[PDB]
């Protein structure tokens, strides 16, 4: 069996840069774009087989406009509605999806911000930046620590940070950061020191992944070579090969799958067998110049559906068979 196609939705004018999905409030997808809006889609799951299988997977519900530049990454609150988004204006914002207004605002990142992420207790907020610094924020949008600086100031990278995520193990909270300096680091929320430096790629990194059980540390990026690492202590298990650039990475919530967006199609490997078993192509093959990449992906809570957001503000949805 495999992944299958249902439709494509078009709600963003420019390249979609992130999708996030909830686990407790399921039929509410949220996607960010280079349009400073932040769209939220509602799911009755229509397939209108009346007009040549009329193409719409759903109906847009709400735009959270208000950011002053491209929105780069978004995430959702793990307990309720709230969402957090980072953008090129150097800000972070907390939105309330039940009313469409912003509620908080994290000022202080001296330059552009590229990644956001929540936590278990939702009190520990991380921001990665072109500042070449990471900063941790509370729920109040005020400062407690900021890891960065050059070698003397500390162990911060020297290029821009490009992505950060947590380790979902509850007795050992950490944060893994991929960088344009071609280096991945692992940190700790206990002391904001680094456990290990996971010195990998030869080109710039744009993606880092942490296993749903927090055991291994997929990271992608420039060369097309994905490297999987050891979360316990920094060990490179094996290498995978995609060929082209890599932007987004994800793990299936429960099934042992790793997905990637690699600039010519979406490539799903297997971790049961370190070998590709699924490629996913854009439906419309028009001969215009180099076709839409997929820029971001996400699974649902149940793994029943994967979402891919591309460079034309088009988002194509992928279901499973049975």
């Amino acid at each position: 069996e495999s992944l299958v196609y249902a439709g494509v939705m078009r709600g963003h004018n420019d390249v979609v840069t992130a999708i996030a999905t909830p686990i407790d409030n399921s039929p509410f997808i949220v996607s960010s774009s280079r349009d400073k809006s932040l769209l939220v889609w509602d799911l009755t799951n229509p397939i209108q087989a009346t007009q040549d299988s009329s193409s719409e997977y759903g109906v847009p519900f709400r735009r959270l406009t208000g950011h002053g530049h491209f929105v780069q990454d978004v995430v959702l609150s793990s307990d309720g509605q709230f969402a957090l988004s980072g953008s090129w204006d150097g800000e972070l914002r907390l939105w309330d999806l039940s009313t469409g207004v912003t509620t908080r605002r994290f000022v202080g990142h001296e330059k552009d911000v590229l990644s956001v992420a929540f936590s278990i207790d939702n009190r520990q907020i991380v921001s990665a930046s072109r500042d070449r610094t990471i900063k941790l924020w509370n729920t109040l949008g005020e400062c407690k620590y900021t890891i960065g600086g050059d070698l003397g100031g500390g162990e911060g990278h020297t290029g821009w940070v490009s992505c950060v995520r947590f380790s979902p193990n509850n007795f050992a909270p950490t944060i893994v950061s991929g960088s344009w300096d071609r280096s991945v680091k692992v940190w700790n929320l206990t002391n904001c020191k680094l456990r290990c430096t996971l010195d990998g790629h030869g080109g710039y990194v744009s993606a880092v992944a942490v296993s749903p059980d927090g055991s291994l540390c997929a990271s992608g990026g420039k060369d097309g070579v994905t490297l999987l690492w050891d979360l316990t202590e920094g060990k490179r298990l094996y290498s995978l090969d995609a060929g082209s650039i890599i932007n987004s990475l994800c793990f299936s919530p429960n099934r042992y799958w790793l997905c990637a967006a690699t600039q010519d199609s979406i490539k799903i490997w297997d971790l049961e067998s370190k070998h590709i078993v699924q490629d996913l192509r854009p439906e419309v093959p028009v001969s215009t110049k180099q076709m839409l990449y997929c820029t971001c992906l996400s699974w649902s809570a149940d793994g029943s559906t994967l979402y891919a957001g591309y460079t034309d503000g088009t988002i194509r949805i992928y279901k499973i068979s049975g």
Partner: protein, 119 residues
């Protein structure tokens, strides 16, 4: 008239040479990258130089190009330029000649020469 002048074109090429790896095909990210490596005195100059570098990368990613010397392609055009076949295609076994060629070879005293015969 949107001809780019010497400063933009020169700076575009000369920043392509120094950092090929850290540039890309999107204008905006290339704008930011170019803001992180060089000191320019106007936003309009930056937008213009980044715009000329982005399609320079598009055509680099396409094929070859003039004066900029990329390392990853100057060695790749050398690794296969010192390239040898299995054995030399210029072989002295079947080299057939026409009347006056053996006439000169008889002039030199190499009348008997292994591998020479008339057309």
């Amino acid at each position: 008239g949107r001809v780019r002048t010497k400063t933009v074109k020169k700076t575009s090429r000369q920043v392509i040479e120094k950092y090929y790896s850290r540039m890309t095909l999107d204008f905006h990210t290339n704008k930011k990258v170019l803001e992180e490596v060089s000191i320019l005195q106007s936003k309009r100059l930056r937008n213009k130089v980044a715009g000329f570098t982005t399609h320079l990368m598009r055509r680099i990613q396409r094929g070859p190009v003039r004066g900029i010397s990329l390392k990853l392609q100057e060695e790749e055009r050398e690794r296969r330029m010192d390239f040898v076949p299995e054995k030399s295609a210029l072989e002295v076994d079947e080299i057939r000649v026409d009347k006056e060629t053996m006439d000169m070879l008889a002039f030199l005293g190499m009348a008997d020469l292994p591998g020479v015969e008339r057309a």
